[PDB]
Amino acid sequence: SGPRLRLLLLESVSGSAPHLPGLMCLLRLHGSVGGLGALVSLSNARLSSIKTRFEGLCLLSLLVGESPTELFQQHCVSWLRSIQQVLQTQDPPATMELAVAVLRDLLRYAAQLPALFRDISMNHLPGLLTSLLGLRPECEQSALEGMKACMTYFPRACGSLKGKLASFFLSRVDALSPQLQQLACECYSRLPSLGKHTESWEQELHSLLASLHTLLGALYEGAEAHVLLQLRQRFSGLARCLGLMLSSEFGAPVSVPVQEILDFICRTLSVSSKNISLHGDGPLRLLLLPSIHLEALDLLSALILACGSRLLRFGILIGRLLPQVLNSWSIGQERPYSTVRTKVYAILELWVQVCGASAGMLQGGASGEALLTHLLSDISPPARKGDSNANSDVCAAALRGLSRTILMCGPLIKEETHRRLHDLVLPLVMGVQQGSSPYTSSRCRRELYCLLLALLLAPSPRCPPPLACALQAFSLGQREDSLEVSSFCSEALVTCAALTHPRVP
């Protein structure tokens, strides 16, 4: 047979350590395992020694994820026992990472088989959790990955060690390493789901809200050297945990305290640079302030994702929040606070995505006028050492927000705004066709062309869009050197042909 000869080919060559990952990739590409006892025996033999543990784990990676269901049912418990054995060998951390990576796939595939699921739940998962908890401090990331894998697919069997798992996750929630902190926050948010689940979720979320309120009061002392940094680390960890709880799948229906979360978000963004007393610890509070606001904005994004268009009755507050944050952080030279403004524009885009034409953005009022004024200034071109594509991240994000809003809410937006966009976008698209500018970036040019197409597709009923000038712009842009811009302009020209040659009277 074909795959049998290629399977036996690598058995004879492995019985080449640097070549092993490529050999496994090639075997997976051919689907040889999916279509085997010698490989299992060889992997078992290799795993029995430290000098060949990596080779055995490499073989096990292929044997686990590509096995037929019969072989997996036959060897799942043996593979689990081997992996648990490896975790107690005082092997180097990389070996632990490989073993945990194999165990993740093994547990995921074992959760799909009821008999294996029941057997591992009753007899094998507490031992795995104990082995992962009993790991050396330099393997704490692999322990977290293994705990997350066990928690995701065997949550009912993780309830006996819930206190130990919570203690393990809490201490690393304020980690200074972004990857370890993110993994610990991901693991902590899964606690209510293991072991009633709805009640546990609600109590945990309210506890997180109370802790976040307490932490913000200490950070904002006097406004609402080293202890402040740990305080902000704890605040960021807890806010990430809350946002993960909001935006992650839960097995039971829950009641979301929308008003409480929105109140916390508004409290966090209510303090600006103007209220901090710059005497003593004040400069540190001022330096840390944008990160706390970014944490609140991430919480807002998580809430929008969790609730969706159900958040429409809170739309007045949500839409007044964005120009407020843009007003707070406003000033080849890069303009400051571009990360906060980009986050605000991403939130605007997400809000229009979940609300569609009901978003109510850019439609009357001081909030809408301020948001439009902020959006127009971040997409305008500028009017030594530096970058030619300076201020292109905020330009692209603002362009995406404007284009999404116009495509969704364009007919309801007044014709004065449409003329304001026509008088600015049209000179811009043909101005980039014929030193430092955000539109030297092809991303910004493509987003500007997307905004032009959105203005064409959803105009005001009292304002005809400039179809001929836009057609000329799309014709010029389809001859661009950049494949992104040119291909987008070609598709936009197809859409404009649909706009120009009607099929209905």
Partner: protein, 363 residues
Amino acid sequence: MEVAVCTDSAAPMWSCIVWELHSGANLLTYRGGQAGPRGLALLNGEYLLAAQLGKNYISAWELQRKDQLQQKIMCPGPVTCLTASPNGLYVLAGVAESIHLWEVSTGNLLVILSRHYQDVSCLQFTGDSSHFISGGKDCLVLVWSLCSVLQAIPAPRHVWSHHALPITDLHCGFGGPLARVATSSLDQTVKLWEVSSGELLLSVLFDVSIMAVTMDLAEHHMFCGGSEGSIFQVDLFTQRERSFAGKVFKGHRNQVTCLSVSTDGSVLLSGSHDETVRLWDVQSKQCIRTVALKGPVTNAAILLAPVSMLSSDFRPSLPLPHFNKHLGGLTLRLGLHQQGSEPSYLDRTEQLQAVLCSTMEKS
């Protein structure tokens, strides 16, 4: 798979019957009271709501249970019409001359819209669920923005008063800003409007009162049910004021009050007061099928059958909230926005190979 959901005024055995369009075999049946005209709604594809005939409450059903739930949506007056949001987030009821709005997430009576000075007759949402249009016996057609109503007394976006007699039916197209609304009235006229501009695009005058109106999704044809039993076809795709041989559906002996079109636009469903629901071929204008009912038809629609009707073990994901009778805490399921976001085979393979390569280099 397409089904026909029909109710009749008598309802001696079944208050509502669901049968397959092309076979005619009863797929689902429901026991209860009597649903009134323009008073049958499907909520989130899992619940069947039926405003009771000449009563002040709304009965609810599970799609796989023939017995109504003990919960009733009680109202301070007789319920005249009932519609549900296409996204399943809101429920509208016409209570006398006021409109009651409920949040299906929480059950709270969010608003009571009192702008009609006579009884509201019909209520309909747009496809994207951003606008809803109400018509009443006061000859008024009101366009309401859901954003403005939820974020507010609220006033309608448009006030259409071109009709001279009470409104009998409404029909909204796909979208909400760029949608078009067809309205019919006892003044023997069917009008077509634009939601964004609020302009009257078309007005067709007939020789009989129009009791029903519908449009195909592509908006090529207008189907208007007359008070004498005739359905008139008006070709939109081929002035601002027209006036109505081979474009009439004949066979009904009484007023046609319900009109629906299939997804492809080739089959037309009509319910009439002669206690009969008929199926028509749009191209040939011939009656494909005739189903006899025990009373005058109050509701009759063609819809794509959801998975809820096709599975006998189906249960709604969330229970029905207690709908408040008088004017944070959203109840919902988490992780739905990321449905289908599971890593693919190549993504998992690349992650595993990255782990293998990282382990190889260090050790």
